[PDB]
Every structure is written in structure tokens, then in C-alpha cells.
């Protein structure tokens, strides 16, 4: 089991660059609209606390340079939606895939296509942390890179990149420009909440272990959901939701291990430790594999 | 800092499905040729001891069903180059990138595009182990998936996938059909040579960990090149060459830590352990990042 991104080609066909003055960020070109972070209109002096509405009233369609490679796409309209800019262009992207905009939940994973001046540079899988950061790899000029999942040739875009916190993790928005977590698009030092372990993903990891014959940790106990949640919080693990119980369903069916029985097994792991014994060859409990990831890799 | 793969679009547009009889695997469509593992011709009986030139001479052009998406491409010629079959089709692939076929060295990395039935499924980064295996993620039907590097719009193909060892590591060939390692395309349980750790990569990775603001493992000591190799070889690490020292220069210059200083650091980590602490979140020393990988990602 290793971290596996989705193939990036459908997304690559949509990466463009958007320039205002000398600031160039990445943008996403779908049909005749280009989506990009709104602070591309920011001057260096205007970033400590920008008045975006005032800054945008001064801009015109001809102030925006949108380029697919070195080819210019003429802007014919602009509007702001939360923290993203929506630039209407005169050409429908012929490489537009079937697509959706979705807001993901903590614990869900997605692939990030790291881009610079519109050129793709790399692809990797990320997990949204419970404190709404992602442990990404982003340099200067990466803003506007997107994160995504592909189900049956349809690309669900879920992330657009905006910021690196002082701790080195990263923060961004969905494709409607709404931040994940309590961050804002200002050149300020912001702190995320304390992070926690993604319980639903650890349980999926335990199911993967069982599937592969590693099952020493299975006990004869069960628990109620509420009892497990109260114990999980004491170990800085996320509480389980009903949605978490449901997405663990296929793995529970495949192994014949009830979700609450597996919760009692993890509960014993938290209270008593791993005893130098390993699970899937590891002494640490992995938490960035979703139940879909586990099913994908099997 | 994360295991990062090349964007896979240029390769995706080349992946097709190839069918002979009851067998289906993936092929690579470049210009007017499709490359795939030769044992797509093997029936279940053939697989234990296939006489490949004999099995292939008894196949005609119309025995091969090549599908590109929903379209079928017509095979108009075929030949075998070692463990790879080359099917000449009557249609050129317009999405053919600029490309080259290369044979990587152990310790080098590449991106794998895992495919099933000619459909791309996932992309992740692999390293050619010293024992010529790769720790990949491959299932039934993945044969014919390829590994590659990219360098300014030029795709350097280096690996085509052929098998999973009983230990779960993977084995395959370059695009000339020659295996990496002592393996052979027959249906048998095969063991690899004893693996060792890619030392130059571990060092590159500790530099990456310092560029990302983690330094707990550093120390005051230095070591000589030979004294480090003595300890390294004792722990089943590959020897470090002066070329490797040079290759690590840019990372040494950036962080101002001399290579043999970092070698002293690694030597202590090997003799004392990690004492339950982690480096870049990992509990184990990582050796699947080359010096080029860390530089490309960090700068
Ligand atoms: C004293 O202020 C701080 C104190 C402590 C930590 C801090 N972090 C940031 C911060 O992140 N700012 C945002 C920008 C804000 C407006 C969202 C930002 O630079 N995003 C980067 C991606 C960054 C850069 C390095 N790799 C990361 O992912 C990006 O691509 C963009 N470049 C520009 C250039 C010009 C105009 C717009 C953009 S948007 C500020 C900051
Ligand atoms: C007693 O024999 C064993 C004992 C102990 C461990 C073993 N491993 C293998 C072994 O790997 N076989 C080869 C096939 C050989 C001929 C190269 C193989 O590649 N199958 C897959 C990829 C595999 C499968 C699971 N994930 C891996 O990546 C593939 O795509 C192909 N399927 C077929 C099906 C029919 C014809 C050609 C191909 S080629 C045999 C074996």
C-alpha cells in the first residue's frame, strides 16, 4: 500500500496562467471560464489587508492576461466569488473534462497537481487534516494549483491553493472560493487549530491489514459509537460520524468485521499501545488512506 | 516535501489495450507501433515454460486485438524484441510525445502510471532497487504499465511491468524488453538478490529534511569517506562514491552542511537508531529520493 495519485492528464489540459501586472498565478480553464485566486489583482503593498471589492472595481477585462502556454485567451468578463476570480474568456476549452465542483470533508484525500506559470510540475496525494490544512509541497508561485478526485472519467475539483502557514502546512479554498478552515487570503501569519488523528482512515488501515492477513489486534469486545468517540477524543483522535460508519461499510462487509468491533480493537490499541508489534510492517498507525483508497488498492 | 510523480498526461494518451485469445494487458502506442509484454500471446498452458519465438511464429496479425478507447487499431505487422512485442498498427498516435527509451541504473527513480485494460488508474514514484526490483503497487492486469521520467516535453521511458515476486516487490523490463535483474517471464516463483539501501538517496533525503526545518539528527562530528563506507556496508548500505559526493554538492551548498558532515549524521542514526523520533514524518530512513528529486521539489 502506497500513496497513489489519480492520473493528472484531464487536469493538465485545464491549467493556464493568469497575470495582472507582474503577478502571475495558476488558473483553471473549464468551458469558457478561468478560475483563479482573487489576490492576483493584489499589489505588493495591497496584500497586508486588501480591499478586494475596491481593487476589483478598478480592474477591467483588458487588465487580465490569460495564457494557455504563450497563447492569449481574451477576457470578456470578470466577477469575484468569495476568494476566487472568475474570468470569462472567448474560447471554450476543448480539453474540458466532465467535471464537478465539490467541498470535501476532513479525512478525504485528493490529488494535487503542482503548477508554476501554468506548467504542471508534479502530482501527489494529499489528505485534508481535521484542522483543515493539508501537508503539501508548494513553493512560491504555486497558488491556483488545484486538488481533485476522478470517478469514472469525471473530475471532482475540491481544492485550489492559496497559502502556506508559518508551520509549513498549506491552506486553500474549494472551487467556489470558500476557504477550508478559519483562514483568510491576507499576507498575515495565521495558525491552524490543533490537529487530530483521522479515525475513519486509521480504521480503514486496520481493515487493509486484516485483508492482508495481519489481524492479531482483533479482540472479542465491541463498543457503542458514543463510548468510542469519548475515548477517541482523550487520545486526540477525531470522533466518528455516521458518514464515517457508512463509508466503512464495504470494508466491514468484505472482512466480516463489524465497524464497532473494529472500533473496540482500535480502542485497545490506543489504551495499551502496539507493544513493538507492527501492523502492515509499521509501528505507527497510518491515517491518510481513506476506505476508498484501501478498496482502490485491492 | 512529498514523494512526487511527474504529470502523467503525455503517457496517458499513449496507453492502449492489447488482446490475444483470452489474455488482456496494456500496451504503449508510440507513432505507429504498440509495445506490450510478449506473453500476451501465452495461453495458461504456455506460461510455465513458453518457447516464445515458437509461440509467436504461429500467431498472425489478426490474432491481436488492439483497442484505443472505443476504437480498434488494425495490426499490420509484428515483431519481438526480447520480452517486448512490437505491433505495427495502421494509424499513427497523434498524442505521441517527444520520447526516448532509456535503461535506468539502480537507485534512480521514475514515475509509474498504473493501467488496467488500457485505462490509466494511478501514478506514483518508484525507485529501481539495488537488487533490480521495485516496490510498486500492481494488480492482475497491470502488465504493460510503464515507468518514465520527463525532461522538458521529452518522456524518457525506462520500465514496462511484467510480474510480482512472491515477496510482493515487482519486476520488469526496459522498453527494449530486457529485464531488470535476474528475472524471467515465466510463471514461476522467483527470488531476488539481497537488497541493500541506496545510500546517496538517504543522504539526499536528510538534506531535504534540513531544507524543511528538521535538524535533530545532525551532530558535531565528521567522518572520512572510507570510514563511512565501512560502517554503511556493515549495515547493508551501498557504498558512497566520490561521484555521489559531487552529486550532493548543490544540496550541501544550499544548507551549508558538508557531505561528510551529513555522513557522520547518518552513521550515528545507523548505530543508535532513531529513538522513536521521526524524520519528515517517517519512522524509517527513506532511500527512494534521488539528489535530483529533492532539488527539483525544493527549488
Ligand atoms: C507575513 O505574512 C505571512 C507570515 C507567515 C506565513 C505566511 N504565509 C503567507 C502566504 O501564504 N501568502 C499567500 C498570499 C496571500 C494573499 C494568500 C501566498 O504567498 N501564497 C503563495 C503560495 C505560498 C508561497 C510559498 N508556498 C506557499 O504555498 C502563492 O502562490 C501566491 N503568490 C502570490 C504573489 C502575489 C500575489 C498573490 C499571490 S498568491 C503569508 C504569510
Ligand atoms: C508459480 O508462479 C508464480 C508463483 C509466485 C508468484 C508469481 N508471480 C507471478 C507473476 O507475476 N506472473 C506474471 C505473468 C508471467 C508469465 C510473467 C504477471 O505479470 N501477472 C500480471 C501482473 C502481476 C499479477 C498481480 N500483480 C502483479 O503485478 C500481469 O499483468 C500479466 N498477466 C498475464 C496473464 C496471462 C498471460 C500473461 C500475463 S502478464 C507468477 C508467480
Numbering used by the authors:
A (entry chain A): 3 to 300
B (entry chain B): 3 to 301
Report text from the authors:
The structures show that the benzothiazole group in YH-53 forms a C-S covalent bond with the sulfur atom of catalytic residue Cys145 in SARS-CoV-2 M pro mutants. The results provided structural insights for understanding the precise inhibition mechanism of the inhibitor against different M pros and strongly indicated the potential of YH-53 to be developed as a broad-spectrum drug candidate.
SARS-CoV-2 M pro is an indispensable enzyme in viral replication and transcription, and it is extremely critical for the cleavage of two polypeptide (pp1a and pp1ab) sequences after a glutamine residue. It has a unique feature of substrate recognition that is not shared by human proteases.
